[PDB]
Coordinates of C-alpha atoms in Angstrom, one line a residue:
Chain A
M1 CA 41.7 14.9 -3.0
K2 CA 39.3 17.9 -3.1
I3 CA 35.6 16.8 -3.9
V4 CA 33.1 19.5 -4.9
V5 CA 29.4 18.9 -4.4
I6 CA 27.3 20.8 -6.8
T7 CA 23.6 21.1 -6.0
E8 CA 21.2 23.9 -6.9
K9 CA 18.7 21.7 -5.0
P10 CA 20.7 20.8 -1.8
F11 CA 20.6 17.4 -0.3
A12 CA 18.9 17.1 3.1
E13 CA 21.1 17.8 6.0
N14 CA 21.7 14.2 7.2
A15 CA 22.6 13.3 3.5
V16 CA 25.2 16.0 3.5
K17 CA 26.4 14.7 6.8
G18 CA 26.8 11.2 5.4
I19 CA 28.6 12.3 2.3
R20 CA 30.9 14.3 4.6
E21 CA 31.6 11.3 6.8
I22 CA 32.3 8.9 3.9
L23 CA 34.8 11.2 2.2
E24 CA 36.4 12.9 5.3
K25 CA 37.3 9.5 6.8
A26 CA 39.1 8.3 3.7
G27 CA 40.1 11.1 4.2
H28 CA 39.5 13.7 1.5
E29 CA 38.1 17.2 1.5
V30 CA 34.5 18.0 0.8
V31 CA 33.4 21.5 -0.5
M32 CA 29.7 22.3 -0.9
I33 CA 28.1 24.5 -3.6
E34 CA 24.5 24.8 -2.6
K35 CA 21.7 27.0 -4.0
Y36 CA 24.2 28.7 -6.3
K37 CA 22.3 31.2 -8.6
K38 CA 25.0 31.9 -11.2
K39 CA 27.0 29.6 -13.6
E40 CA 30.1 31.4 -12.6
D41 CA 29.8 30.4 -8.9
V42 CA 30.3 26.8 -9.8
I43 CA 33.1 27.7 -12.4
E44 CA 35.2 29.5 -9.8
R45 CA 34.9 26.7 -7.3
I46 CA 35.4 23.7 -9.6
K47 CA 39.0 24.7 -10.8
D48 CA 40.8 22.9 -7.9
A49 CA 38.5 19.9 -7.9
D50 CA 39.5 16.2 -8.2
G51 CA 35.9 14.9 -8.0
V52 CA 32.3 16.1 -8.4
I53 CA 28.9 14.9 -7.1
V54 CA 25.8 16.4 -8.7
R55 CA 22.1 15.9 -8.7
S56 CA 20.1 17.0 -11.8
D57 CA 22.4 20.1 -12.3
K58 CA 23.5 20.9 -15.8
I59 CA 27.3 20.1 -16.1
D60 CA 28.2 21.5 -19.5
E61 CA 31.3 21.8 -21.6
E62 CA 32.5 25.1 -20.1
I63 CA 32.2 23.8 -16.5
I64 CA 33.9 20.6 -17.5
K65 CA 36.8 22.5 -19.1
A66 CA 37.1 24.7 -16.0
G67 CA 37.6 21.3 -14.1
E68 CA 41.2 21.0 -15.2
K69 CA 42.1 18.0 -12.9
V70 CA 38.6 16.5 -12.3
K71 CA 38.9 12.8 -12.8
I72 CA 35.4 11.6 -11.8
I73 CA 31.8 13.0 -11.7
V74 CA 29.1 11.1 -10.0
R75 CA 25.4 11.8 -10.6
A76 CA 23.5 11.0 -7.5
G77 CA 20.4 9.4 -9.2
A78 CA 19.4 7.5 -12.3
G79 CA 19.6 9.9 -15.3
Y80 CA 22.7 11.7 -16.6
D81 CA 21.2 13.7 -19.4
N82 CA 22.2 16.7 -17.4
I83 CA 26.0 16.0 -17.9
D84 CA 27.8 16.6 -21.2
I85 CA 29.2 13.1 -21.7
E86 CA 31.2 13.8 -24.8
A87 CA 33.0 16.8 -23.2
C88 CA 33.8 14.4 -20.3
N89 CA 35.2 11.8 -22.6
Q90 CA 37.3 14.5 -24.3
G91 CA 38.7 15.3 -20.8
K92 CA 39.3 11.7 -19.6
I93 CA 36.6 12.1 -16.9
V94 CA 34.9 9.1 -15.5
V95 CA 31.1 9.6 -15.2
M96 CA 28.9 7.5 -13.0
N97 CA 25.3 7.5 -11.8
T98 CA 24.0 5.6 -8.8
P99 CA 21.7 2.8 -10.0
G100 CA 19.3 0.9 -7.6
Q101 CA 19.2 3.7 -5.0
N102 CA 15.4 4.4 -5.6
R103 CA 14.2 0.8 -5.8
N104 CA 12.3 0.7 -2.5
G105 CA 10.7 4.1 -3.2
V106 CA 9.3 2.9 -6.5
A107 CA 8.5 -0.7 -5.2
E108 CA 6.5 0.7 -2.2
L109 CA 4.7 3.1 -4.6
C110 CA 3.8 0.1 -6.8
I111 CA 2.4 -1.8 -3.8
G112 CA 0.5 1.2 -2.5
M113 CA -1.0 1.8 -5.9
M114 CA -2.1 -1.8 -6.2
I115 CA -3.9 -1.7 -2.9
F116 CA -5.3 1.7 -4.0
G117 CA -6.6 0.4 -7.3
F118 CA -8.0 -2.8 -5.7
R119 CA -9.8 -0.5 -3.3
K120 CA -11.4 1.9 -5.7
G121 CA -9.1 4.8 -4.7
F122 CA -10.2 4.5 -1.1
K123 CA -13.8 5.4 -2.1
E124 CA -17.1 3.5 -1.7
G125 CA -17.5 0.1 -3.3
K126 CA -16.6 -3.6 -3.3
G127 CA -12.8 -4.0 -2.9
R128 CA -10.4 -6.8 -3.3
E129 CA -7.2 -8.0 -1.6
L130 CA -3.7 -8.7 -2.8
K131 CA -3.1 -11.6 -0.4
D132 CA -3.3 -14.9 -2.3
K133 CA -3.5 -13.3 -5.7
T134 CA -0.9 -14.1 -8.2
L135 CA 1.3 -11.2 -9.3
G136 CA 3.0 -11.2 -12.6
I137 CA 6.2 -9.2 -12.4
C138 CA 7.4 -7.8 -15.7
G139 CA 11.1 -6.9 -15.4
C140 CA 13.1 -8.4 -12.6
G141 CA 15.7 -5.6 -12.3
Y142 CA 16.2 -3.6 -9.0
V143 CA 12.6 -2.5 -8.7
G144 CA 11.1 -5.8 -9.9
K145 CA 13.2 -7.8 -7.3
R146 CA 12.1 -5.5 -4.4
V147 CA 8.4 -5.7 -5.6
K148 CA 8.7 -9.5 -5.4
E149 CA 10.0 -9.2 -1.8
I150 CA 7.2 -6.9 -0.7
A151 CA 4.5 -8.7 -2.6
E152 CA 5.6 -12.0 -1.1
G153 CA 5.6 -10.3 2.3
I154 CA 2.0 -9.4 2.0
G155 CA 1.2 -12.9 0.7
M156 CA 1.0 -12.7 -3.0
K157 CA 2.1 -15.6 -5.2
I158 CA 4.7 -14.7 -7.8
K159 CA 5.5 -15.2 -11.4
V160 CA 8.2 -13.4 -13.4
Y161 CA 9.0 -12.4 -16.9
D162 CA 12.2 -10.7 -18.1
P163 CA 13.9 -11.3 -21.4
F164 CA 17.2 -9.6 -20.3
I165 CA 17.7 -11.4 -17.0
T166 CA 18.1 -15.1 -16.3
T167 CA 16.3 -15.9 -13.0
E168 CA 15.2 -19.2 -11.5
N169 CA 11.5 -19.7 -12.4
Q170 CA 10.8 -17.2 -15.3
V171 CA 8.1 -17.7 -17.8
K172 CA 9.3 -17.8 -21.4
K173 CA 6.5 -15.9 -23.1
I174 CA 5.0 -12.8 -21.6
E175 CA 1.5 -14.0 -22.8
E176 CA 1.9 -16.7 -20.1
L177 CA 2.1 -14.1 -17.2
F178 CA -1.0 -12.3 -18.5
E179 CA -2.9 -15.6 -18.7
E180 CA -1.8 -16.9 -15.3
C181 CA -1.7 -13.7 -13.1
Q182 CA -4.5 -11.5 -11.6
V183 CA -2.2 -8.6 -11.2
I184 CA 0.6 -7.4 -13.4
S185 CA 3.4 -5.2 -12.4
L186 CA 5.4 -3.3 -15.2
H187 CA 9.1 -2.5 -14.6
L188 CA 10.6 -2.9 -18.1
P189 CA 12.9 -0.5 -19.9
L190 CA 11.5 1.3 -23.0
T191 CA 13.0 -0.1 -26.2
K192 CA 12.0 -0.9 -29.8
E193 CA 11.3 -4.4 -28.4
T194 CA 9.2 -3.2 -25.5
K195 CA 7.6 -0.1 -27.2
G196 CA 3.8 -0.5 -27.4
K197 CA 4.2 -4.1 -26.3
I198 CA 1.3 -4.1 -23.7
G199 CA -1.7 -3.9 -26.0
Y200 CA -5.1 -5.3 -26.7
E201 CA -4.3 -8.9 -27.5
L202 CA -2.1 -9.3 -24.4
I203 CA -4.2 -7.5 -21.8
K204 CA -7.4 -9.3 -23.0
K205 CA -6.0 -12.5 -21.5
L206 CA -6.2 -11.3 -17.9
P207 CA -8.7 -13.0 -15.7
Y208 CA -11.8 -11.2 -14.3
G209 CA -10.8 -8.2 -12.1
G210 CA -7.3 -8.1 -13.8
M211 CA -5.0 -5.2 -12.8
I212 CA -2.0 -3.7 -14.4
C213 CA 0.3 -1.3 -12.4
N214 CA 2.9 0.7 -14.3
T215 CA 5.9 2.3 -12.5
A216 CA 8.2 2.3 -15.7
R217 CA 7.4 4.3 -18.9
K218 CA 4.1 5.2 -20.6
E219 CA 5.4 4.1 -24.0
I220 CA 5.5 0.4 -23.3
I221 CA 1.7 0.6 -23.4
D222 CA -0.3 0.5 -26.6
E223 CA -2.6 3.3 -25.5
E224 CA -5.3 2.8 -28.0
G225 CA -5.1 -1.0 -27.4
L226 CA -5.5 -0.6 -23.7
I227 CA -8.4 1.8 -24.2
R228 CA -10.2 -0.6 -26.5
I229 CA -9.9 -3.5 -24.0
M230 CA -10.9 -1.3 -21.0
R231 CA -14.1 -0.2 -22.9
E232 CA -15.1 -3.9 -23.4
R233 CA -13.7 -5.0 -20.1
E234 CA -15.1 -2.8 -17.4
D235 CA -13.5 -5.1 -14.8
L236 CA -10.0 -4.2 -15.8
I237 CA -8.0 -1.7 -13.6
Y238 CA -5.0 0.4 -14.6
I239 CA -2.8 2.3 -12.1
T240 CA 0.3 4.1 -13.3
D241 CA 3.1 6.4 -12.0
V242 CA 3.7 7.4 -15.6
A243 CA 0.6 9.2 -16.9
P244 CA -0.7 8.3 -20.4
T245 CA -0.7 10.8 -23.3
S246 CA -4.3 10.1 -24.2
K247 CA -7.0 12.1 -22.1
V248 CA -9.5 9.3 -22.7
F249 CA -8.3 7.2 -19.6
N250 CA -9.2 10.1 -17.2
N251 CA -12.4 11.0 -19.0
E252 CA -13.9 7.5 -19.3
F253 CA -12.3 5.1 -16.8
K254 CA -12.7 6.9 -13.4
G255 CA -13.2 4.3 -10.7
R256 CA -10.7 1.9 -12.4
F257 CA -7.9 4.2 -13.5
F258 CA -5.4 6.4 -11.7
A259 CA -2.3 8.3 -12.8
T260 CA 0.0 10.4 -10.6
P261 CA 0.4 13.9 -11.9
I262 CA 4.2 13.5 -12.1
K263 CA 6.4 10.4 -11.8
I264 CA 6.9 10.1 -8.0
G265 CA 8.3 6.6 -7.7
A266 CA 11.8 7.9 -6.8
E267 CA 10.6 11.1 -5.0
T268 CA 11.4 9.9 -1.4
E269 CA 13.8 11.3 1.2
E270 CA 15.3 7.9 1.4
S271 CA 15.9 7.7 -2.3
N272 CA 17.8 11.0 -2.2
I273 CA 20.0 10.2 0.7
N274 CA 20.7 6.7 -0.7
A275 CA 21.8 8.3 -4.0
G276 CA 23.9 11.0 -2.4
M277 CA 25.7 8.6 -0.1
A278 CA 26.1 6.0 -2.9
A279 CA 27.8 8.8 -4.9
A280 CA 30.2 9.5 -2.0
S281 CA 31.1 5.8 -1.5
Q282 CA 31.6 5.3 -5.2
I283 CA 34.0 8.2 -5.4
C284 CA 35.9 7.0 -2.3
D285 CA 36.1 3.6 -4.1
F286 CA 37.3 5.1 -7.3
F287 CA 40.3 6.9 -5.6
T288 CA 41.0 4.1 -3.2
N289 CA 40.8 1.0 -5.6
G290 CA 40.1 2.4 -9.1
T291 CA 36.6 0.9 -9.0
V292 CA 34.7 2.1 -12.1
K293 CA 31.6 0.0 -11.7
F294 CA 28.6 2.1 -12.7
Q295 CA 30.7 4.1 -15.1
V296 CA 28.4 5.1 -17.9
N297 CA 30.9 6.6 -20.3
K298 CA 34.2 5.3 -21.8
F299 CA 37.3 6.8 -23.3
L300 CA 40.8 6.2 -24.6
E301 CA 43.8 6.9 -22.4
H302 CA 46.1 8.1 -25.3
Chain B
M1 CA -31.2 -30.3 9.4
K2 CA -32.8 -27.5 7.3
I3 CA -30.7 -24.3 7.1
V4 CA -32.2 -21.1 5.7
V5 CA -30.0 -18.3 4.3
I6 CA -31.6 -14.9 4.5
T7 CA -30.0 -12.2 2.4
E8 CA -31.6 -9.1 0.9
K9 CA -28.1 -8.4 -0.5
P10 CA -27.1 -11.8 -1.8
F11 CA -23.6 -13.4 -1.3
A12 CA -21.4 -13.6 -4.4
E13 CA -22.1 -16.8 -6.4
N14 CA -18.9 -18.7 -5.2
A15 CA -19.7 -17.8 -1.6
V16 CA -23.1 -19.4 -2.0
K17 CA -21.4 -22.4 -3.6
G18 CA -19.1 -22.8 -0.7
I19 CA -21.8 -22.5 1.9
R20 CA -23.7 -25.1 -0.1
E21 CA -20.7 -27.4 -0.1
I22 CA -20.0 -27.1 3.6
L23 CA -23.6 -27.9 4.6
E24 CA -24.6 -30.5 2.0
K25 CA -21.5 -32.5 2.6
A26 CA -22.4 -32.9 6.2
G27 CA -25.9 -34.0 5.1
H28 CA -27.9 -30.8 5.7
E29 CA -30.1 -28.9 3.3
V30 CA -29.6 -25.3 2.2
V31 CA -32.6 -23.0 1.4
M32 CA -31.7 -19.7 -0.1
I33 CA -33.8 -16.5 0.4
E34 CA -32.1 -13.9 -1.8
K35 CA -33.3 -10.4 -2.9
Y36 CA -36.5 -11.0 -0.9
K37 CA -39.2 -8.4 -0.6
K38 CA -41.6 -7.7 2.2
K39 CA -41.2 -10.1 5.2
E40 CA -43.8 -12.6 4.5
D41 CA -41.2 -14.2 2.2
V42 CA -39.0 -14.8 5.3
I43 CA -41.7 -15.7 7.8
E44 CA -43.4 -18.3 5.5
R45 CA -40.0 -19.8 4.6
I46 CA -38.4 -19.8 8.1
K47 CA -41.1 -21.9 9.8
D48 CA -39.4 -25.2 8.9
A49 CA -35.9 -23.9 9.6
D50 CA -33.4 -25.5 12.0
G51 CA -30.8 -22.8 11.5
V52 CA -30.2 -19.4 9.9
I53 CA -27.3 -17.5 8.2
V54 CA -27.9 -13.8 7.7
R55 CA -25.9 -10.7 6.9
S56 CA -27.1 -7.2 7.9
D57 CA -30.8 -8.3 7.5
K58 CA -33.2 -7.3 10.3
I59 CA -34.2 -10.4 12.2
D60 CA -36.9 -9.1 14.6
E61 CA -39.1 -10.9 17.2
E62 CA -41.9 -11.8 14.7
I63 CA -39.4 -13.6 12.5
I64 CA -37.8 -15.3 15.5
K65 CA -41.1 -16.5 16.8
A66 CA -42.1 -17.9 13.3
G67 CA -38.9 -20.1 13.6
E68 CA -40.2 -22.2 16.4
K69 CA -37.6 -25.0 15.9
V70 CA -34.7 -22.8 14.8
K71 CA -31.8 -23.6 17.1
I72 CA -29.1 -21.3 15.7
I73 CA -28.7 -18.0 13.8
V74 CA -25.2 -17.0 12.5
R75 CA -24.5 -13.5 11.4
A76 CA -21.9 -13.6 8.6
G77 CA -20.0 -10.5 9.8
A78 CA -18.8 -8.7 12.9
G79 CA -21.9 -6.8 14.1
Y80 CA -25.2 -8.3 15.2
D81 CA -27.5 -5.6 16.4
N82 CA -29.7 -6.4 13.3
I83 CA -30.7 -9.4 15.3
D84 CA -33.1 -9.1 18.3
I85 CA -31.0 -10.9 20.9
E86 CA -33.7 -10.8 23.6
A87 CA -36.2 -12.6 21.5
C88 CA -33.5 -15.2 20.7
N89 CA -32.8 -15.7 24.4
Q90 CA -36.5 -16.1 25.1
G91 CA -36.5 -18.7 22.3
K92 CA -33.3 -20.6 23.4
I93 CA -31.6 -19.8 20.1
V94 CA -27.8 -19.6 19.9
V95 CA -26.6 -16.5 18.2
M96 CA -23.1 -16.2 16.6
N97 CA -21.2 -13.8 14.5
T98 CA -18.0 -14.7 12.5
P99 CA -15.1 -12.8 14.1
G100 CA -11.8 -12.4 12.3
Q101 CA -13.1 -12.9 8.8
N102 CA -12.4 -9.3 7.6
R103 CA -9.0 -8.9 9.2
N104 CA -6.9 -9.0 6.0
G105 CA -9.2 -6.6 4.3
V106 CA -8.7 -4.0 7.1
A107 CA -4.9 -4.7 7.4
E108 CA -4.3 -4.2 3.7
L109 CA -6.3 -1.1 3.8
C110 CA -4.1 0.1 6.7
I111 CA -0.8 -0.5 4.9
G112 CA -2.2 1.0 1.7
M113 CA -3.3 4.1 3.7
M114 CA 0.1 4.3 5.2
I115 CA 1.9 4.3 1.9
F116 CA -0.7 6.7 0.6
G117 CA -0.2 9.0 3.6
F118 CA 3.6 8.8 3.2
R119 CA 3.4 9.6 -0.5
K120 CA 1.2 12.7 -0.2
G121 CA -1.9 10.9 -1.5
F122 CA 0.0 10.1 -4.6
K123 CA 0.5 13.7 -5.5
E124 CA 3.6 15.8 -6.1
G125 CA 6.0 16.3 -3.2
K126 CA 8.6 14.7 -1.0
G127 CA 7.6 11.2 0.1
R128 CA 8.8 8.8 2.7
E129 CA 9.1 5.0 2.9
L130 CA 7.7 2.5 5.5
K131 CA 10.8 0.2 5.1
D132 CA 13.0 0.5 8.2
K133 CA 10.5 2.7 10.1
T134 CA 9.2 1.6 13.5
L135 CA 5.5 0.9 13.5
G136 CA 3.6 1.1 16.8
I137 CA 0.6 -1.2 16.7
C138 CA -2.1 -0.3 19.2
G139 CA -4.3 -3.4 19.7
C140 CA -3.0 -6.8 18.7
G141 CA -6.2 -8.7 18.1
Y142 CA -7.2 -10.0 14.7
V143 CA -6.5 -6.8 12.7
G144 CA -3.5 -5.9 14.8
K145 CA -1.6 -9.3 14.2
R146 CA -2.2 -9.3 10.5
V147 CA -1.0 -5.7 10.2
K148 CA 2.1 -6.9 12.2
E149 CA 2.7 -9.6 9.5
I150 CA 2.3 -7.3 6.6
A151 CA 4.4 -4.5 8.1
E152 CA 7.1 -7.0 8.9
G153 CA 7.0 -8.3 5.3
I154 CA 7.7 -5.0 3.9
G155 CA 10.5 -4.2 6.3
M156 CA 9.0 -2.2 9.2
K157 CA 10.2 -2.6 12.8
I158 CA 7.5 -3.4 15.2
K159 CA 6.4 -2.5 18.6
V160 CA 3.0 -3.2 20.1
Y161 CA 0.7 -2.0 22.8
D162 CA -2.5 -3.8 24.0
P163 CA -3.8 -3.6 27.6
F164 CA -6.2 -6.5 27.0
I165 CA -4.1 -9.3 25.6
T166 CA -0.6 -10.4 26.8
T167 CA 1.9 -10.8 23.9
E168 CA 5.6 -11.5 23.9
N169 CA 7.2 -7.9 23.8
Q170 CA 4.4 -5.4 24.5
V171 CA 5.2 -2.0 25.9
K172 CA 3.5 -1.2 29.2
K173 CA 2.2 2.3 28.4
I174 CA 1.1 3.8 25.1
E175 CA 3.3 6.8 25.8
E176 CA 6.2 4.6 25.0
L177 CA 4.8 3.6 21.6
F178 CA 4.2 7.2 20.7
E179 CA 7.8 8.2 21.8
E180 CA 9.5 5.4 20.1
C181 CA 7.6 4.8 16.8
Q182 CA 7.5 6.9 13.6
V183 CA 4.2 5.4 12.6
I184 CA 1.2 4.4 14.8
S185 CA -1.7 2.2 13.7
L186 CA -4.9 2.1 15.8
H187 CA -6.9 -1.1 16.1
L188 CA -8.4 -0.6 19.6
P189 CA -12.0 -1.2 20.6
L190 CA -14.0 1.9 21.8
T191 CA -14.1 1.6 25.5
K192 CA -14.4 3.9 28.6
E193 CA -10.6 3.8 28.8
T194 CA -9.9 4.1 25.1
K195 CA -12.5 6.9 24.5
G196 CA -10.6 10.1 23.5
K197 CA -7.3 8.5 24.6
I198 CA -5.4 9.6 21.5
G199 CA -5.0 13.3 22.2
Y200 CA -2.7 16.3 22.4
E201 CA -0.2 15.1 25.0
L202 CA 0.2 11.7 23.6
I203 CA 0.4 12.6 19.9
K204 CA 2.8 15.5 20.6
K205 CA 5.5 12.9 21.5
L206 CA 5.7 11.5 18.0
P207 CA 9.0 12.1 16.1
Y208 CA 9.3 14.4 13.1
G209 CA 7.1 13.2 10.2
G210 CA 4.9 11.2 12.6
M211 CA 1.9 9.3 11.1
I212 CA -1.2 7.9 12.6
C213 CA -3.5 5.5 10.8
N214 CA -6.8 4.7 12.4
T215 CA -9.0 1.8 11.1
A216 CA -11.0 1.3 14.3
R217 CA -13.4 4.0 15.7
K218 CA -13.4 7.8 15.4
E219 CA -14.1 8.1 19.1
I220 CA -10.7 7.0 20.4
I221 CA -9.4 10.3 19.1
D222 CA -9.5 13.5 21.0
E223 CA -10.4 15.5 17.9
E224 CA -9.7 18.9 19.6
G225 CA -6.4 17.6 20.8
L226 CA -5.4 16.1 17.4
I227 CA -6.5 19.4 15.8
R228 CA -4.4 21.5 18.2
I229 CA -1.3 19.5 17.6
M230 CA -1.6 19.2 13.9
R231 CA -1.8 23.0 13.7
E232 CA 1.4 23.2 15.8
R233 CA 3.1 20.2 14.1
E234 CA 2.7 20.6 10.3
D235 CA 4.8 17.5 9.8
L236 CA 2.3 15.1 11.3
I237 CA 0.0 13.0 9.1
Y238 CA -3.4 11.5 9.9
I239 CA -5.1 8.8 7.7
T240 CA -8.3 7.2 8.8
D241 CA -10.9 4.7 7.6
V242 CA -13.2 6.2 10.2
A243 CA -13.7 9.9 9.2
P244 CA -13.7 12.4 12.1
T245 CA -16.8 14.5 13.1
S246 CA -15.1 17.9 12.8
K247 CA -14.8 19.6 9.4
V248 CA -11.5 21.2 10.4
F249 CA -9.3 18.3 9.3
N250 CA -10.5 18.5 5.7
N251 CA -10.6 22.3 5.6
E252 CA -7.1 22.9 7.0
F253 CA -4.9 19.7 6.7
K254 CA -5.1 18.7 3.1
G255 CA -1.9 17.1 2.0
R256 CA -1.4 15.6 5.5
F257 CA -5.0 14.2 6.2
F258 CA -7.3 11.7 4.5
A259 CA -10.5 10.0 5.4
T260 CA -12.4 7.5 3.4
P261 CA -16.1 8.6 2.8
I262 CA -17.2 5.5 4.7
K263 CA -15.6 2.7 6.5
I264 CA -14.4 0.4 3.7
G265 CA -12.0 -1.7 5.8
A266 CA -14.3 -4.8 5.6
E267 CA -15.6 -4.1 2.1
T268 CA -13.8 -6.7 0.2
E269 CA -15.2 -9.7 -1.7
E270 CA -12.8 -11.9 0.3
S271 CA -14.2 -10.6 3.6
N272 CA -17.7 -11.4 2.4
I273 CA -16.9 -15.0 1.4
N274 CA -14.8 -15.6 4.5
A275 CA -17.7 -14.6 6.6
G276 CA -20.4 -16.5 4.6
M277 CA -18.4 -19.8 4.8
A278 CA -17.3 -19.3 8.4
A279 CA -21.0 -19.1 9.2
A280 CA -21.7 -22.3 7.2
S281 CA -18.8 -23.9 9.0
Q282 CA -19.8 -22.7 12.4
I283 CA -23.4 -24.1 11.8
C284 CA -22.1 -27.5 10.6
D285 CA -19.8 -27.6 13.7
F286 CA -22.6 -26.6 16.0
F287 CA -25.0 -29.4 14.8
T288 CA -22.2 -32.0 14.4
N289 CA -20.5 -31.3 17.7
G290 CA -22.5 -28.7 19.7
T291 CA -19.6 -26.2 19.3
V292 CA -20.7 -22.8 20.6
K293 CA -17.5 -20.9 20.1
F294 CA -18.4 -17.3 18.9
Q295 CA -21.8 -17.5 20.5
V296 CA -22.6 -13.9 21.6
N297 CA -25.7 -14.5 23.6
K298 CA -26.6 -16.7 26.6
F299 CA -29.7 -18.2 28.0
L300 CA -31.1 -20.7 30.5
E301 CA -31.3 -24.2 29.1

């Protein structure tokens, strides 16, 4: 099997080495396409390919049709918007991503941000400590679970809410977390259910010095609601890796508000090698055993 | 026993409550002197005092002489130069601080700064993770041991150096820590030996993407050495709660250098209440049982 690796933004050298090792041992061929400047470059190369690994590169219909006998394309990372899924279905091409490969990067950023917020951005003033505080974890997926492990490590007590997962001690109503926890960590997927869900009435319930850290999406916040409660509750802190739309937070709440300029939760060298190497092992597995765990598309075999 | 509590900057209300509880339960009386102005306020009130708890307040000879039957003063905190130790010796007054009460504050600041450093100050760019990296702890006293616990909790591998205390696995020479660890944390006292010890030759040995986090003293760094090596090694990161003297770090090394505007390691509400109640507890213990653990002075009886 020939495996082409298409990356305008190349993986780090040790990641490439690892992808090589996983596939050459099994033992397939690996062919790199790195820093290509022209759509045709990838088209020439992909014609003989059985498999593909990509990062955020656009894999469109033409490219996919050039890939006559490509059976599988693995996105090293979370999103796959960059790949034409319908054109892949048309061609009986299994499409995967690599879920859970950024979890520690996002969780450590959450913990760092919590310490940062509790310490006034490492500026002058009276700080607080995470040890012995109760953390309310919202979403107990990949990220949520790792945050629990780190938060416990540093000596926080834990409560959890997640309406999609069943886990040992979860609280039933999210209101309960906000009542009973000093610090809230948000790791929920954005849906109609969760859209705008974190708003005035809920946030209001936090105890004095309450803190909310958001590593997920801006849209699960009710921005005007959070603004209202922060204006009346000057003790509340909000730290987020997903900047709000409203410019009010930055204008009014300095000293108890921080947003990264860009979502950096997953921007770690480790996240990138974890994803690249997961992509390799998942492709090895597909050809070895037909394993299609993490397949994000589906098609008929008529 | 009458115990007076002298604080221009008062304790938080719950700290006061806990200090009250500890002393009134053992049968003593607590007199609070908060927000006071002048010095008369303290002198008049200290006359009848058997003991004193203070923070950064200046306690000079005049005040100490006013307290004729004062037997013990406890500084809720680390330092105690605010107290005239000579006058307390002359007076046969036991003086204590409360060591180890700010340890978690400094340790959490250290880990926070490490994540911060590794994630470009929470700005755009390629970050790294502490999990699975090897941390070299320099100094394994109160702060050092707590940093060990937190760093372990979040998945770092640990190696330690401390020429003062003997611990299970310590390395013999600092050079070994700097060769074998990705991240170094500094919690060493400033000493003839430690002064300017962290310098060019030592730092240069760090692996690629090396990071040093200092929460102790600025003086254990050889600033010119650190400057020279950071200019050569653009990969190296330096984060500190004790800002350097030289302007160069801020001018040249943005993106791989941060210093807090002042030392905030111990500035947490918890550190303050830990210290206030340790002081109360150390006074109860002194009167109840004559315990003089943490006494920082000595005198002829």
